[PDB]
């Protein structure tokens, strides 16, 4: 990918870049999933051993306060601001807010809201005054790459994201193990109740949570499962990674071309009765200028 920016890339030291990041040593892990209920079109399989070079990865998704500092320093205008609208979940649109008639096929709970963007996540009249440490949302893949580049960083590959999110466990279902609420404790921010009609908020949140909510995984990463979908570097496919080759098993970058970029981790909207996509092997995608109230990112870096 070859992006274009209208800000210069600032000089930053290794110590500055590494703040808030954890060092993942080089090594192998078992990537992918073979849950019999996985949707074939998602391409969770095959399970395979992947070798990665050492990398750094953010403990937290990028927050509102951090994204605000980037915008203040650069004047960056997000894709949602250029388009003039972004996607908001229906339950979060205040009555009377102007909304577009737009329809996401098969997903009527998504509303296209003029004026929804990172600083006004439910549309005009909303703000982030009480969410400085929540993940930034309504950021597209382009916006994420711009932030990451300004910060001296990059997006993780899907394999880097998954190695880090698995937190040293071999083929567990979730970042922390195989049970969703071990010891009766919520470990992530997803949906509870009846999707899309009623979220009971049993885990404490019916929207985004602070980036440091819940216990971390074994490598010190927070909210890799749930909270917000997280953009990765790779172009999406369902089958490129089914080939067994150095390109797909050593520092894999995904296919060279595509139409949508990978997103990982699930969000506050995910639920077992609908998508079941908060398992660590899960994966989907979105087109790179798209944005939504449940999608953000975390950065990686080369040491």
């Amino acid at each position: 990918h070859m992006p274009s920016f209208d800000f210069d890339i600032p000089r930053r030291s290794p110590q500055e870049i590494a703040k808030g990041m954890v060092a993942i040593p080089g090594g192998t892990f078992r990537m992918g999933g073979e849950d019999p209920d996985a949707f074939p079109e998602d391409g969770e399989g095959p399970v395979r051993t992947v070798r990665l070079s050492p990398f750094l990865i953010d403990r937290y998704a990028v927050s509102n306060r951090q994204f605000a500092a980037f915008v203040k320093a650069t004047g960056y205008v997000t894709d949602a601001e250029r388009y003039g609208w972004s996607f908001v979940f229906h339950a979060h649109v205040a009555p009377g807010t102007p909304v577009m008639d737009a329809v996401v096929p098969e997903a009527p709970w998504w509303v296209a809201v003029p004026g929804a963007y990172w600083k006004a996540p439910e549309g005009p009249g909303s703000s982030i005054t009480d969410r400085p440490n929540h993940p930034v949302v309504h950021v597209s893949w382009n916006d994420a790459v711009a932030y990451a580049t300004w910060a001296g960083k990059r997006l993780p590959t899907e394999a880097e994201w998954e190695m880090a999110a698995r937190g040293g466990l071999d083929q567990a279902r979730y970042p922390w193990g195989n049970e969703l609420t071990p010891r009766g404790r919520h470990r992530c921010n997803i949906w509870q109740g009846t999707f899309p009609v009623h979220d009971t908020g049993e885990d404490g949140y019916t929207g985004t949570a602070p980036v440091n909510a819940f216990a971390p995984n074994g490598y010190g990463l927070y909210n890799v499962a749930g909270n917000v979908w997280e953009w990765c570097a790779d172009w999406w496919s369902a089958d490129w990674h089914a080939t067994e080759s150095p390109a797909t098993r050593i520092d894999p970058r995904g296919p060279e071309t595509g139409t949508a970029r990978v997103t990982k981790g699930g969000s506050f909207l995910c639920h077992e009765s609908y998508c079941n996509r908060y398992r660590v092997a899960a994966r989907t995608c979105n087109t790179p200028d798209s944005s939504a109230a449940h999608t953000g990112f975390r950065c990686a870096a080369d040491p």
């Binding site: 949707f39 079109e41 998602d42 388009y83 996607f87 737009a102 329809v103 996401v104 096929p105 098969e106 997903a107 998504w110 296209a112 979908w229 949508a260 997103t263 699930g266 969000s267 909207l269 995910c270 609908y274 998508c275 079941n276 996509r277 989907t284 995608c285 979105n286 087109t287 200028d289 798209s290 939504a292 999608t295």
Partner: peptide, 17 residues
């Protein structure tokens, strides 16, 4: 789920006519 559940709503997806 009748077709594959959708978690990522795309700007392209709403264009239709």
């Amino acid at each position: 789920x009748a077709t594959t559940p959708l978690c990522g709503p795309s700007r392209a997806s709403i264009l239709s006519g």
